[PDB]
Chain A
Amino acid sequence: TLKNKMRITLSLPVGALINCCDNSGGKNLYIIAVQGFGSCLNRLPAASLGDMVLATVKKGKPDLRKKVLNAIICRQSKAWRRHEGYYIYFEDNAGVIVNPKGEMKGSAITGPVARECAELWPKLSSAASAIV
């Protein structure tokens, strides 16, 4: 319950296909909109690590497909600066399917999870096995 996210370099605009990195059944997430995005004329809404987005799954369980659902970004392949002084990037883009309230639909995270996302979403960090 603290949303002082601190600015992370925007990656993953609308239309990005990322991995699901959870056991919910989905295999990929098609970013559809970014929560909290305001109004700029030709600006594509874009998301960062701690961001909740709206997405549809294109590969995965039919029960999950063809629907609008919420996801939280966990891994971002674009380098971002954390204030310690260096730049960090994963090798893939990945987010987990969550309830609009922010609670996971699956039970476990496959790969590492960004610390910035982990401290924004507490019950997500518990499911995370490795927080980097």
Chain B
Amino acid sequence: SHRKFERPRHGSLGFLPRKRCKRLRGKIRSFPKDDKEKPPHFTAFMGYKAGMTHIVREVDKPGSKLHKKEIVEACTIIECAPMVVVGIVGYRETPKGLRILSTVWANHVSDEFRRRYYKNWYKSEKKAFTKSLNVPEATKNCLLKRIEKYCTVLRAICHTQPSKTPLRMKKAHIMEVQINGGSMKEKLEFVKEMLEKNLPVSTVFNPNEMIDVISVTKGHGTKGVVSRYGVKRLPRKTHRGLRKVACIGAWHPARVQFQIPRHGQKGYFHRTERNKKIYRIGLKTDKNSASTDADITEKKITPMGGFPHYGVVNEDFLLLKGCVAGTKKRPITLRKNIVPQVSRDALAQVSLKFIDTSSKIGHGRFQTSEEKVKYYGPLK
């Protein structure tokens, strides 16, 4: 018979199967739709989760209970060392999907990039990419001309530089960033120009821009149904334990449906979360990257004592409003919005007054070690 009381199902069937992700790196399922009118531009970037802090910003929402008051918001720090463009991939449309016409490479690739092709780089003689890079310039131009003639989707292969981060990993994460913009000719020229140089975050993203974040959630091994799906605990009197689903299906159909929550892997899931706003693109060069006009102190983004479980952010970074899936050190793919947003949140010009740099270990009271030593005075 029917349920006595109706309540919505536990969890979303749109994130099935809740299995471990195939890879650690976040993978773009689909790039933003190409607009021919816009000039050629990159559409994605990769960084690493460093940690979280909180900022103070003045609200400019008329008719809101906050409005002219200053509020505190949590933010995520993603260290974004400049990416390196090393390749070009041409895609053409077929009834079977997108087909690679060819990928051409730059004249030189770094050992960091080459390490990604090796499971044991230390004991190998590192012969990868050693003789295919001497291809003639005429053949390169032939392949590029054929790409221009027959391809409709252009992607640039670019890789991270983990040596610029505190990561123990040395092999670079390499991905394809789709070039969206003008004609095929303009796209090819745009990528050819920076076929070998660094790609900083600032050329891909602007401040106060909404982006999507693609990453892999924090792993938790196999978890019970209570934690994995949020089902209600059975009463204390339950004979064979209470942390489970009581009825896993009616008599008929004489099977267990795939919609029934069960114990299994929780976390380490691929997730694409939309509409994270860039609050600040902090440059590596300037020493006041964490300073504001209302603070005028000289301090960088890294909290005193370092970012817990990550290290020190010594490179370009961006301050994302809110939270982002993954652990510290996790590679995080930043993607441009699939369609540009015209909402007031997306277009708002953020004016942040204070960026916290107190110790994230324990309850830090000071923003800088200099302030700490000044407050305490001389010791033994």
Contact = CB atoms under 8 A, between A and B. Distances in A.
B100 interface: no
Interface string A22-48: 000000000000000000111000000
Contact of A4 (B5, B54, B56, B64): B64
A40 B66 CA distance: 29
B35 interface: no
A85 B7 contact: no
A42 B56 CA distance: 38
A101 interface: no
B232 A84 contact: no
B87 to A, nearest CB: 46
Given A40-B7, A41-B5, A42-B232, A84 B70 contact: yes
A84 B65 contact: no
**Majority secondary structure of chain B interface residues (helix, strand, loop or mixed):** loop
A8 B56 CA distance: 20
A115 to B, nearest CB: 10
Contact of B65 (A4, A40, A42, A85): A4
B69 interface: yes
Contact of A85 (B5, B66, B72): B72
A83 to B, nearest CB: 4
Nearest to A120: B65
Interface size classification for chain A: 10 to 19
A6 interface: yes
B363 to A, nearest CB: 13
B4 to A, nearest CB: 10
A119 B66 CA distance: 12
A84 B57 CA distance: 10
Interface size classification for chain B: 10 to 19
B260 interface: no
Nearest to A119: B65
Interface in A76-121: 83-85, 119
Contacts of B54: 85
A108 to B, nearest CB: 26
Contacts of B65: 4-6, 119
A119 B7 CA distance: 35
B259 to A, nearest CB: 18
A83 B65 CA distance: 10
Interface in B242-297: none
Contacts of B232: 42
Nearest to B64: A4
Contacts of B13: none
A16 B168 CA distance: 54
A83 B72 contact: yes
B69 A85 contact: no
Interface in B13-67: 54, 56, 63-66
Indicate the member of B7, B63, B64, B232 with the most A CB atoms within 10 Å. B7
Contact of A84 (B5, B7, B64, B71): B71
Contacts of A119: 65
Interface in B52-110: 54, 56, 63-66, 69-72
Given A41-B5, A41-B7, A85 B64 contact: no
A4 B61 CA distance: 13
A50 B64 CA distance: 16
A83 B66 contact: yes
Nearest to A43: B7
A5 B65 CA distance: 8
A29 B227 CA distance: 37
A87 to B, nearest CB: 11
Contacts of B56: 85
A83 B71 contact: yes
Nearest to A82: B71
A6 B67 CA distance: 12
B310 to A, nearest CB: 24
Interface of A: 4-6, 40-42, 83-85, 119
15 contacts: A4-B64, A4-B65, A5-B65, A6-B66, A40-B7, A83-B66, A83-B69, A83-B71, A83-B72, A84-B69, A84-B70, A84-B71, A85-B54, A85-B71, A85-B72
Sorted nearest first, the 7 A-B pairs with minimum C-beta distance are: A85-B72, A41-B7, A83-B71, A6-B65, A4-B65, A83-B66, A41-B5
Given A83-B69, A119-B65, 12 more contacts: A4-B63, A4-B64, A4-B65, A6-B66, A42-B232, A83-B66, A83-B71, A83-B72, A84-B69, A85-B54, A85-B71, A85-B72
